[PDB]
Design a protein around this ligand. Sequence first.
Ligand SMILES: [Cl-]
Ligand SMILES: [Cl-]
Ligand SMILES: [Cl-]
Ligand SMILES: [Cl-]
Lengths: 297, 297
Amino acid sequence: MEKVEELKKEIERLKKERNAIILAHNYQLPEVQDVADFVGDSLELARKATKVDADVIVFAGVDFMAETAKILNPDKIVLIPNKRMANMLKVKHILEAKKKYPNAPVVLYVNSTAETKAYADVTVTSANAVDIIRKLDSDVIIFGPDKNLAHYVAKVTGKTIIPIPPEGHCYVHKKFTIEDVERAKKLHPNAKLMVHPECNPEVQEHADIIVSTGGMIRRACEWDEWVVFTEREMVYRLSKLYPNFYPAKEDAVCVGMKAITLQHVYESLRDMKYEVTVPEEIAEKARKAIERMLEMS
Amino acid sequence: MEKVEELKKEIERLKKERNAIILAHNYQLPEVQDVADFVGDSLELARKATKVDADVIVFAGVDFMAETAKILNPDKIVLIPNKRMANMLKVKHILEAKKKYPNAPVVLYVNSTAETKAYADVTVTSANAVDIIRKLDSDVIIFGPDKNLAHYVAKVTGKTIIPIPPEGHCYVHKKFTIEDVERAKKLHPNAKLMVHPECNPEVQEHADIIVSTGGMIRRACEWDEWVVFTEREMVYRLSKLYPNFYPAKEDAVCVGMKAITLQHVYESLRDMKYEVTVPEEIAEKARKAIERMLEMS
Ligand SMILES: [Cl-]
Ligand SMILES: [Cl-]
Ligand SMILES: [Cl-]
Ligand SMILES: [Cl-]
């Protein structure tokens, strides 16, 4: 195609004009990798991000890795070409875990909030998690937010893995967000919203009516169809009750996300599009754990 | 050490006597990798397992990968050197997901029951999940049981990822097991057991008393301290209520697991120790999805 070749020509030009370097993950599209200056795994990209002299970094990759590069580059401009379950981990979880196991290091999988990396000793990617967790002196380790990875490491190193957030708790109401609220208005515009008390306080604010499980099965008579911010069972239950209800979230996870294409990279260099920002207070704190991971890996 | 060198000498001898090959994962201990005939990643090991002529395979690796090799080798003996959240996915989940999205392929992360691989089109490892999910013709994909991986793929391919088990549901009571019951007897021997109705029916059988959330906060007067098989909040709640309660599970995940050491490999060749078995009915079905993954990767 001539479209493709013209894009690459524009991308190469904008590189010099913006003074930009382009990093892409190994799982990105070939066309994106082609224009990328560096292509690698999560760790390689993290390490490459400490050695950038360009004023601008285009991070052709997933969000938390883009964020991780910005944390390594506070005085540069980090861009993610496209628009954007890691918000499960709260700082309180780390404090309660450090209270019971005070000599256990806090290890966070790279997919985590910067706010929580600020309370971690070291970060890991999937490929270095076992390597690093073995290396830590303690045989008791605090680890999150990825349960699967936590179980996996547990199984391979045999060490005592204390997961965060702790298991034995239901996190359904926490996985609702302000963006889930707005979607329930642009869509289902003629409808009022039910919100369980245990939801995000930000979510509680835009809540039309606020009811618990019993409050829902009673006040479900002030509209024809509702938008219920709770366990999905309660959608079928109100449905059977009053045949004259839509779940707050769709089945598909992170829908709306578009893969990063050659055009995305072009439009990002040209518009300085989608800039990754982290508060310096939290960034400079969270940065310690990331650099530690580079030291051990 | 001379202990080490004598072990390797015994391992090498037992190799010929049993007619065995030893496979080890890249994240295993160096000493284990040393005696291993083949060392690789999850995919490499899966592929290597279709090309074994030995009568015995020692799988120095995590359980679901050991299981995956047995599925590729029904007529051989597969051994895992040591004693043993994938049981979250049930077949019903796949049927309900295929009902709403009938033209969506069922993709399962390798860490899943064989019983569910029997209802899958293809399996993935972390390193090939994006590669393969992109390759599938459909833009709607059913994917589990690993939410993290599902979100990650969603973000990178932009496709519509329908997770299994579906989100918006609490799975606390399902993550209890018969082994969690037995642990609450060898430990806390002088105590009776509370079990929520929504637990495993196998778990329900060994349940002393069976009560719901309200039934628990009432019948908590027939012992001094209890073992509560429910959400951990209910442990602190009974605690505050009747100061005259222990969670059913410990904080640490998969504790008891021991890393595979040089001795484990020796003791496994010598005792034919810890044999991985999968029912041929289910194995020969589950095998299709694994071989498909090798074809696409
Ligand atoms: Cl990335
Ligand atoms: Cl976009
Ligand atoms: Cl393995
Ligand atoms: Cl063992």
